[PDB]
């Protein structure tokens, strides 16, 4: 592996030398990049044919480095949230949330006014208080009586249509896992696939893992079958 | 139960770097509003007393913090070392600009300081200059304060 | 001591869209990349491939064999 550059070099890094020497050795010749993204591997041929190989490599190394910087940002947020500090990196909202409309989404700030709640240590709210507030929030009270006020249905719209199998015995069916059904069936028709010697890549579609091995086996046994009869 | 060990190597890794400027794509009014509105809403001319108390105590907190910090001996050594380093760098830069501007207008060691007292090396001229500038800056405060608080 | 937080969101900077609690919502955010649950194992495959490069755990055995 050291000759094909498939793995990192022979003695580039030493766990007991120093940090400076190790970053020097790794910053030397694109040692921080895998072979697939190392530009030297491709710097010699790229021209009229496709115009892509040297482009579709610098356009992948960029996505790679973006992923790495995002990981650093997430870990700084987690390290701030490990204490009770406010997070340094404000990220945009996601698929279930909207932005606050008092702040713009900038969650906190600096103010030149000393924020006495921190200075005296009163920034956490005493469990019993929160318990009371929530228990009173999840229990709306009805003071009126539906006799006096002719209110027959609970609040909401279209109550009339709302007023008109064995899920109670075996629970509901989970609908997030249909995409694996097919493979499961295969794993029941071919018990021999559970042998302790085999270890496929892994995946669900016809392009991954179990089905790849199965198609390969059937195709190669058919190839050998046809090669038996010709002779 | 296994025993754990101290980790002394590339520890953390995510702190060696300032990445604040990349994530916000660069390439605090609700705060004060809420503070002041709250002290207005809760507790004539009483809002003015409360606001003046707030501002005064904040400035005093910052000043007390600074002075108490600078009152530790080692912090004074730190300050002195920085002062002499900056003075030598200013000497270099000023010499360069002076000589080259002289040219173009014709066209158009450290230990003797680091090992001595500092009030005997520095003249009184600079103390008088600092005091004069400060005095001149803050001399209009009584009239300003009076004219503000009287409607 | 000088850090203050928004009092509505309590320093989260983000509130919920309640309709999405019980052709989607047009008001609330955009999905992320690791939300597509059909592409999970492919992304993990690429990542473990790239990680096998740097991995220097088995270094001494490879060294003696080399």
């Amino acid at each position: 592996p050291y000759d094909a550059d498939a793995n990192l070099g022979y003695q580039i890094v030493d766990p007991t030398a120093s940090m400076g020497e190790n970053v020097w050795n790794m910053a030397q010749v694109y040692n921080s990049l895998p072979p697939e993204l190392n530009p030297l591997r491709t710097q010699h041929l790229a021209d009229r044919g496709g115009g892509n190989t040297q482009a579709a490599v610098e356009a992948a190394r960029s996505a790679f480095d973006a992923q790495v910087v995002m990981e650093a940002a997430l870990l700084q947020n987690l390290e701030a949230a490990a204490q009770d500090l406010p997070k340094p990196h404000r990220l945009p909202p996601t698929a279930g949330t909207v932005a606050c409309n008092e702040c713009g989404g900038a969650a906190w700030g600096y103010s030149f006014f000393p924020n006495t709640a921190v200075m005296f240590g009163l920034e956490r709210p005493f469990w019993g208080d929160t318990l009371a507030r929530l228990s009173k929030y999840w229990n709306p009270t009805q003071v009126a009586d539906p006799a006096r006020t002719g209110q027959l249905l609970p609040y909401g719209e279209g109550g009339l249509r709302r007023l008109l199998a064995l899920e109670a015995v075996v629970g509901k069916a989970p609908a997030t896992t249909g995409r694996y059904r097919r493979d499961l069936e295969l794993l029941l028709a071919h018990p021999e696939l559970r042998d302790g010697a085999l270890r496929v890549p892994g995946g669900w579609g016809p392009e991954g893992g179990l089905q790849t091995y199965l198609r390969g086996q059937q195709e190669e046994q058919a190839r050998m079958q046809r090669r038996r009869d010709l002779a | 139960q296994s025993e754990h060990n101290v980790k002394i190597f590339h520890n953390s890794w995510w702190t060696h770097l300032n990445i604040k400027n990349l994530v916000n794509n660069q390439d605090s009014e609700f705060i004060n509003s809420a503070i002041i509105k709250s002290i207005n809403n809760k507790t004539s001319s009483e809002k003015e007393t409360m606001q003046l108390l707030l501002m005064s105590s904040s400035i005093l907190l910052h000043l007390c913090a600074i002075i108490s910090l600078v009152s530790i001996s080692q912090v004074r050594c730190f300050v002195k070392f920085h002062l002499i380093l900056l003075y030598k760098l200013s000497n270099v830069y000023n010499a360069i600009l002076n000589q080259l501007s002289n040219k173009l207008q014709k066209n158009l060691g450290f230990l003797v300081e680091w090992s001595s007292d500092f009030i005997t090396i520095i003249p009184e001229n600079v103390d008088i200059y600092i005091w004069n500038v400060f005095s001149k800056i803050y001399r209009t405060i009584p009239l300003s304060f009076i004219s503000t608080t009287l409607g | 001591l000088l850090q203050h937080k928004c009092q509505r969101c309590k320093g989260a900077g983000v509130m919920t869209c309640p309709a999405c609690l019980g052709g989607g919502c047009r008001v609330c955010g955009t999905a992320c990349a690791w939300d597509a649950e059909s592409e999970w194992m492919e992304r993990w495959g690429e990542w473990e491939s790239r990680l096998a490069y740097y991995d220097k755990a088995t270094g001494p055995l490879m060294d003696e064999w080399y």
Binding site: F120, L122, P125 | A34, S38, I39, K42, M50 | Q7
Partner: peptide, 15 residues
């Protein structure tokens, strides 16, 4: 700042 703290402790929601 301990005089105003009951006032300024509404910005956090406590008493």
């Amino acid at each position: 700042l301990a005089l105003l703290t009951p006032t300024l402790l509404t910005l956090t929601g406590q008493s």
